[PDB]
Amino acid sequence: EDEDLDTDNDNIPDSYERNGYTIKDLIAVKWEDSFAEQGYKKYVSNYLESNTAGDPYTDYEKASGSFDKAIKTEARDPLVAAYPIVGVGMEKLIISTNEHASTTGLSINKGESAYINANVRYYNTGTAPMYKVTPTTNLVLDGDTLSTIKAQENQIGNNLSPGDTYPKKGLSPLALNTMDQFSSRLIAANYDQLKKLDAGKQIKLETTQVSGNFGTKNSSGQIVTEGNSWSDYISQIDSISASIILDTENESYERRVTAKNLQDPEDKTPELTIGEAIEKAFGATKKDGLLYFNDIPIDESCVELIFDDNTANKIKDSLKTLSDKKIYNVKLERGMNILIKT
Amino acid sequence: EDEDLDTDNDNIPDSYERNGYTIKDLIAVKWEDSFAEQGYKKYVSNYLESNTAGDPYTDYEKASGSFDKAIKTEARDPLVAAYPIVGVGMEKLIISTNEHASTTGLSINKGESAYINANVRYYNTGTAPMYKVTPTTNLVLDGDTLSTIKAQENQIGNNLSPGDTYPKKGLSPLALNTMDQFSSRLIAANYDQLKKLDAGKQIKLETTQVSGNFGTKNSSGQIVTEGNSWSDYISQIDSISASIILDTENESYERRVTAKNLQDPEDKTPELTIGEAIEKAFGATKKDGLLYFNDIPIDESCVELIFDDNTANKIKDSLKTLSDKKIYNVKLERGMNILIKT
Amino acid sequence: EDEDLDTDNDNIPDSYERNGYTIKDLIAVKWEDSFAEQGYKKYVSNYLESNTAGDPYTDYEKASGSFDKAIKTEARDPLVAAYPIVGVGMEKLIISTNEHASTTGLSINKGESAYINANVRYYNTGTAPMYKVTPTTNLVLDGDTLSTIKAQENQIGNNLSPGDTYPKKGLSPLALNTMDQFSSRLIAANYDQLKKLDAGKQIKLETTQVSGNFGTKNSSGQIVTEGNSWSDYISQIDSISASIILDTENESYERRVTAKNLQDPEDKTPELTIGEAIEKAFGATKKDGLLYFNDIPIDESCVELIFDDNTANKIKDSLKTLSDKKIYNVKLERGMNILIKT
Amino acid sequence: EDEDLDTDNDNIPDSYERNGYTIKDLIAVKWEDSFAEQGYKKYVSNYLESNTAGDPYTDYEKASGSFDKAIKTEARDPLVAAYPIVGVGMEKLIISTNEHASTTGLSINKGESAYINANVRYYNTGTAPMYKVTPTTNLVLDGDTLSTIKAQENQIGNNLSPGDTYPKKGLSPLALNTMDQFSSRLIAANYDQLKKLDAGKQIKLETTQVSGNFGTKNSSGQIVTEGNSWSDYISQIDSISASIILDTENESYERRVTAKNLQDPEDKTPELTIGEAIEKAFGATKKDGLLYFNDIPIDESCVELIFDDNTANKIKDSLKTLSDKKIYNVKLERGMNILIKT
Amino acid sequence: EDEDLDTDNDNIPDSYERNGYTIKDLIAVKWEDSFAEQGYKKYVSNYLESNTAGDPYTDYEKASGSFDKAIKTEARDPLVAAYPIVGVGMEKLIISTNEHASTTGLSINKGESAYINANVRYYNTGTAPMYKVTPTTNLVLDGDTLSTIKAQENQIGNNLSPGDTYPKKGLSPLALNTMDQFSSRLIAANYDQLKKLDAGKQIKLETTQVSGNFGTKNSSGQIVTEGNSWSDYISQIDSISASIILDTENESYERRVTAKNLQDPEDKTPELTIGEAIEKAFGATKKDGLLYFNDIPIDESCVELIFDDNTANKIKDSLKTLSDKKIYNVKLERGMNILIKT
């Protein structure tokens, strides 16, 4: 009954955070099943923790709506993890060749003769914005693993809205050829690697890491992104949560949802199943008693649940005890990943 | 009746911010319909929020007039959004070619032989000033997507008054050729791209982002623009508001006006219609019971409401229920845009 | 009667700042018409504002004289605005040509062959000093709009007294050829622009902006110019005040004085007319019941009041209702400008 | 009688600072004419000001002797101004010519062929030390106004005692050729300006400004010169005081002494006359009832009081009313200057 | 009798600092002549000053022994001044000449052809250490006054013990050829100055100034040398003290001892005599009723008191009134200097 006693100092009780609860007028309301039709929802969380997943907001601050505005409405639930991830796309790699007087002809230096140039474009898929992007990307020549570069002081960009490109849709890509104000590097073994680049235009561009920022909110301390860094939360998140990826023919989505280790006798997060988790992640609800999208179904005759080895072997080891034989009705796995092709 | 009880600690009551209200002698006055003729106006705002739109001032601070002086009088209302946006214009791109001894002639380096130079000019259209401008702009060569640059330490400029150019009217434009004190880059493939520049002078300049500052005001802490940054508010604003653009033959204006999501049962901003919102944005009032400008009519036989697809399809999907058939009398769409040609 | 009740916390009452007042022995004295002959003057200001013009000093602190000492005695009145503006003059542009072995002769590089050099001199005309000057200036070649530069670390200068040059009168000008420790730039298209400079010595120098500092004063916090900046007050000032320029055959003057918008029901600055405003700006008083200078008459038979379009059209639109037909006796215009030739 | 009531919070009374006073045992003693023979002196100052002249110390702090020790004993009186000024002397300008293979001979670059070098030496004449000197000096070629330079990071120097040189007497001068670690500049138009330097060795060196620091003293906060800049007091001083220059055939002296504007009805500094002020500045006293030096007479048969125009015209305009006809017995002029040649 | 009343807040009484006193167990003991044989000594100081000499420690803190440990035992007395001074010695100047292809031979650049290199060594003679040394030294070519340089970041050094070299005895000297990571400068007029260096190896190395640090001591704020600078105490010291230089055939010492001006009626330091001051500076005592060194007599038949002009003329001007005719028994001179050759 909790007797209105808090154990975390997170302004929320611990039977409220044990049974179902929701939030009205910035005050913890207990629960009644009536106001589900009113438009409200239900939440459960960790009554012993100041913040369930790793993400830097507390349980009440994520559940109310006084944390940000730009973050999508799915992230107001304490099970999901409000954190973004950005991908870099490449095109139009151009070159300039043979520095002095050619396209050897006695005045072509085997180093520093053909400078490189690439065009890229960032895009964010996830749940949150990042008010700065510094990605480090590297280039590879069909298995030769050539130079790596940081974003310099003029390709850093700025705030990155959810589901958007870095140049907003209808603009030309971003140019890249620098190593701190130094035109970058010859495709190295000159009369060899340029002739590899003759019929072997396989300059592949990979991303390794990005770094960004977020924002905290007060009244007097209004909004600051000066030192709030995102590079020291991914290790906290990914060693707890599991990953869920959905994709249509025109969009993509990735989410990180938490779980529980069964061996630890002192974890107090609620249990889950993946048929509840795909509902809890997105805006997907039930349209005929089974899980549907905004306009699409997601059911067993419509899923293409493409697993991998660490997920498939554990589900094939644990799909023997139950008799209902439902893949959606299994306990989560701390570290798993799931693909929903459609 | 609210019993003089504040719920946000924003020095304003919550029936005052629920019904109509205005501000006299820096004190919240309730409302009387008499003094509209006196010169006063009416306001309404969000009784649960410390700041209605995303912009960094509060409800009372925007409604009174003790926030700035340079901001135009339309922004003193808590529904509009006091934030600016700057455009860059280009002209007069000049070149210097063929470095050593020509206009190949055996001494023309295939990289770094024709340095580029552009002339630019900023302008601000919106509602607010920005006390610093760092725009990042890129150049594109009829679909070749060439280099991008930040404004250096000597092209940054200074305070930018609303509706003005960066060099005030009657001055020459700005020169641009730098990559941190390095003359920029050859039009890359020398004997190819210069001959593309022979008959193909299509060096298009595009803007990608800008960054600036604003100003907070105290008595002892008078005016500071040292750390107040504008790059961490656009993501908060644009994921809430809608956009409205007006343009005559000699000027242009763009505004951001807020709205409400109907599915969210804990939003407490008032509702709107676009026929009220075009009046609420500008200094436009009614001159014959219908909306007029300073000296211009803006009515259904004079508007050119040129939509786009996401606005036109939703208004054509929701123009079936009502019987009056008025495009001005519809609920707003959180994310829509509107062009009003004249 | 005000009952000695302050509404701004600016240590001055609000019938004192409503009727006339003056200041004796650092105490607000009410007003009496007797001691005008004594040497005292009269002031009136905004009883609802902590600083009635934009300038960073308060009403009392500007009215007393415990703010600075180098500021001219006209600025002790709350109607005028104590802020300076500096103009740069150019002369003696010299060159150095044709870098390797000439005055083409086969060893002249089409970029980087003739470095430029200009001589400049600052001066201040206005009401205040500026303890640092960083002007950004650009050069133009008969409508070609060439490079722009910031004052470097060795050409910034120092404190700049009112009505003085930057090198005090009787010294040679300043030399300018830098782009951060890099001899400047060739007059670009070498064998073209040097031959334009043959008979076309039209290198015009233009100013775009300056930046400086000011000084606040305490006893324990004596005088600091390290954090104070002037680039965040001009937008506040110029969107309020009007401008007045006077010039004899040997000097020049420009001032910024305030006004009121008539539509706003909650502004509380007193009214004005230009016939009292030219008196209130300068040290000009009446010598025969009409406005005279230090030794010069300034009256309708001596003025050459050269307007512009926004001033002339409004004065010819509003010079119909009155019957006295006096241009000096009109309400001010918020944004106007006035030249007084003599 | 002042009733021991202070009006400035400067620990000194206000009839004490109205009549004569002096300071014994760090306590304000009133005045009695007996102890003038004891070795004491008399002072009078501004009972409404925390510091009379611009200089950063207060009235009591200058009158006692607990402010510094290196400042000369004339400055312990609240009428004089304790501030220094430094002059730069030039000699021995040397050159290095014709960079590649000469003293044109087909390999002499018309820019950057003959680097310059000058020898300088600072000296201070005035009343105070400066613990750092950064002078900006420029060079001129018989009316061509060549480059200007700041003192770099290794020609700054250190503390500068009053009446001394920067290298103490018996050392070689300072070498100067840098523009931030870059050998300076060719005497520009090479085959022209070197031949101007053939018979026209007229490289004149001029000073424009200097910058330095001073020292404040506490017990716990002992002595700091970190931020106490001198560049923000000269504008306060020179718009109040007048200047007095004395010179023998082996030394020089310059001082700044305060005054009063007669039109201002609320200034409260004492009056003066120049025959009192020349005694009040220096250690000069009366040896036969008339002003003498340490060993020299300064009287009407010994002065060579060389005025300028703004001093001569005002003294010839105001030497008519009095009947005694004494130039020493006139009221001071706020802005005047005086040369006492001997 | 002083009634145990302090006037400076320096924890010491003011008859104790008026008569003789000594410090036992960190408590001010009054005096009695008995404990002179015990090993104790006598001190007297300025009862009106918080620190009698210029040096940054107080009277009590210098008299006790709780200030530092590396400072020599002579400096524990408030008459002497604990500050060091460092001399630079030079040897082994080497060269590297004629850069391209020679020892003119058509390929010797008249600038930048023979880089210079010197060997230096610091030493300290005085009373204190300095935990950092940055000396600026200049070079002169037989009266041509060549370049000057600061010690760079790799030649600064570290803590410098009293009476030691900078490399401790038995190490090679320091190499010097830099102007901020730039091999320094040709001996300028190449084919002239190298031939001056043929038979004219007169590269004299002079020192001009140094800069260093010191150390303050607390328990919680244990030892800091971060901002404690020595460049702002020499002007305070040298305008008060006189200088005394002693030298054997194998060592040298210099000291700065305070004095008193007679014309100032409010100085309160005790008087001195030079025969007492030579004893009070060093560890010299009396061995036969006359002053002896550690093992050396220093008396009138052993001194070689080599004066200079300002000392000799004043002692020959004031050696007439007294009848005993003793040069050791004269009042000190504020500004004098004294050499004791032995």
DSSP string over E58-116: -HHHHHHT-S-SSS-GGGGSTTB-----EEEEEEEEEEE--TTT----S---SSS-SEE
Closest Cα to residue C186, out of C225, C214, C147, C156?
A: C147
Task: Give C157's contacts in chain D (Cβ within 8 Å).
Answer: 208-209
Closest Cα to residue C240, out of C270, C223, C261, C224?
A: C261
CA C280, CA C76: separation in Å to the nearest integer?
A: 11
Tell me the backbone φ, ψ of residue A64, rounded to 5 degrees. -85, -65
Closest Cα to residue B80, out of B141, B143, B128, B30?
A: B128
Count CB atoms within 10 A of the CB of residue A49: 18
With touching defined as 3 or more inter-chain CB pairs under 8 Å, the answer for chains B and C is yes
- β-strand partners of C141: C203
Helix (H) or strand (E) holding D63: helix D59-64
CA atoms within 13 A on the CB side of A21: 24
Q: Which residues of A are annotated as a binding site for Ca(2+)?
A: 6, 8, 10, 12, 14, 17, 46, 49, 59
Distance from CA of D109 to the nearest CA of C (A): 4
- β-strand partners of B206: B138
Which one of E7, E148, E229 has the shortest CB-CB distance to D155?
E148
CB-CB contact of D57 with D77 (8 Å): no
Q: Specify the pairing of strand B203-211 against strand E174-176.
A: unpaired
Structure tokens given for E261: 């001006």
The DSSP call for residue B165 is B
CB-CB contact of A72 with A119 (8 Å): no
- Is residue B158 less than 8 Å (CB to CB) from chain C? yes
With touching defined as 3 or more inter-chain CB pairs under 8 Å, the answer for chains C and D is yes
Closest Cα to residue A77, out of A239, A279, A295?
A: A279
3-state SS assignment for residue D5: coil
- Best mutation target among A103, A112, A154, A185 (most B Cβ atoms within 10 Å) is A154
Identity at D182, one-letter amino acid code = F
Tell me the backbone φ, ψ of residue E279, rounded to 5 degrees. -70, -40
The DSSP call for residue D328 is G
What letters, b where the CB count within 10 A reaches 16 and e where it falls short, cover B154-182?
bbbbbbbbbebbbbeeebbbbbbbbbeee
- Is residue E26 less than 8 Å (CB to CB) from chain D? no
CA A151, CA A148: separation in Å to the nearest integer?
A: 10
End-to-end CA distance of chain D: 45
Which one of D108, D209, D238 has the shortest CB-CB distance to C157?
D209
Tell me the backbone φ, ψ of residue E244, rounded to 5 degrees. -135, 125
Structure tokens given for B218: 């105290």
Given resolution (angstroms) = 4.2
User: B99 and C108: CB-CB below 8 Å?
Assistant: no
CA B204, CA B189: separation in Å to the nearest integer?
A: 18
Closest Cα to residue E23, out of E65, E64, E61, E77?
A: E64
- Is residue C29 less than 8 Å (CB to CB) from chain D? no
CA D292, CA C275: separation in Å to the nearest integer?
A: 56
Count CB atoms within 10 A of the CB of residue A295: 6
CB-CB contact of C112 with C193 (8 Å): no
Structure tokens given for C339: 């030249």
Chains that touch A (3 or more CB pairs under 8 A): B
Question: CA separation (Å) from E264 to A256, D24, D80, E48?
Answer: 83, 12, 19, 14
- Is residue B136 less than 8 Å (CB to CB) from chain A? yes
Closest Cα to residue A255, out of A270, A233, A277, A276?
A: A277
CA A341, CA A335: separation in Å to the nearest integer?
A: 20
Q: What is the count of residue pairs from B and C with beta carbons less than 8 Å apart?
A: 114
Q: Residue written as tokens 């000449």?
A: E97
**Angle at the Cα of B37 from the Cα atoms of B33 and B42, rounded to 5 degrees:** 50
3-state SS assignment for residue C317: helix
CA D38, CA A318: separation in Å to the nearest integer?
A: 109
CA E145, CA E139: separation in Å to the nearest integer?
A: 6
Helix (H) or strand (E) holding B278: helix B274-281
User: B240 and A173: CB-CB below 8 Å?
Assistant: no
Structure tokens given for E177: 């050829």
CA D250, CA D163: separation in Å to the nearest integer?
A: 12
Identity at C331, one-letter amino acid code = K
CB-CB contact of A125 with A89 (8 Å): no
3-state SS assignment for residue E275: helix
CA C88, CA C166: separation in Å to the nearest integer?
A: 10
Distance from CA of D84 to the nearest CA of E (A): 14
- Best mutation target among E266, E269, E310 (most D Cβ atoms within 10 Å) is E266
Question: CA separation (Å) from A159 to A122, A271, B17, B123?
Answer: 12, 36, 32, 22
Sorted by sequence, the CB contacts under 8 Å of residue A253 that are 6+ apart come out as: A125, A245, A246, A247, A282
- Is residue C283 less than 8 Å (CB to CB) from chain D? no
Structure tokens given for E24: 């036992």
- In terms of Cβ atoms closer than 10 Å to its own Cβ (0-12, 13-18, 19+), residue A308 is exposed
Question: CA separation (Å) from E224 to A234, C147, E228?
Answer: 40, 49, 8
CB-CB contact of B80 with B255 (8 Å): yes
- Is residue E317 less than 8 Å (CB to CB) from chain D? no
Q: Residue written as tokens 């402010």?
A: D67
Closest Cα to residue D188, out of A176, E210, C95?
A: C95
Q: What is the count of residue pairs from C and D with beta carbons less than 8 Å apart?
A: 115
Chains that touch E (3 or more CB pairs under 8 A): D
User: D138 and C175: CB-CB below 8 Å?
Assistant: yes
3-state SS assignment for residue D90: strand
**Please, after which residues is chain D broken with C–N above 2.5 Å?**
103
Residues 110 to 129 of B: which have CB under 8 A from any A CB? 110-111
CA A105, CA A190: separation in Å to the nearest integer?
A: 13
User: D109 and C99: CB-CB below 8 Å?
Assistant: yes
User: C69 and D54: CB-CB below 8 Å?
Assistant: yes
Which residue in chain C has the smallest CA separation from B169? Answer: C208
Structure tokens given for B235: 């993501």
- Is residue D136 less than 8 Å (CB to CB) from chain C? yes
3-state SS assignment for residue D50: coil
Task: Give D68's contacts in chain E (Cβ within 8 Å).
Answer: 236
Which one of E110, E231, E238 has the shortest CB-CB distance to D131?
E231
Residues 169 to 208 of C: which have CB under 8 A from any D CB? 171-175, 177, 181, 183
Count CB atoms within 10 A of the CB of residue D97: 20
The beta strand positions in chain C, using DSSP E, are 22-24, 27-29, 86-96, 115-124, 134-141, 148-150, 174-176, 203-211, 216-217, 223-224, 242-247, 252-257, 285-286, 291-292, 304-306, 337-341
CA B137, CA B207: separation in Å to the nearest integer?
A: 5
- Is residue E130 less than 8 Å (CB to CB) from chain D? no
Task: Give A41's contacts in chain B (Cβ within 8 Å).
Answer: none
Structure tokens given for C64: 């007393």
- Is residue A215 less than 8 Å (CB to CB) from chain B? yes
The DSSP call for residue C153 is T
User: D158 and E106: CB-CB below 8 Å?
Assistant: no
Which one of B101, B102, B155 has the shortest CB-CB distance to C148?
B155
- Is residue D102 less than 8 Å (CB to CB) from chain E? yes
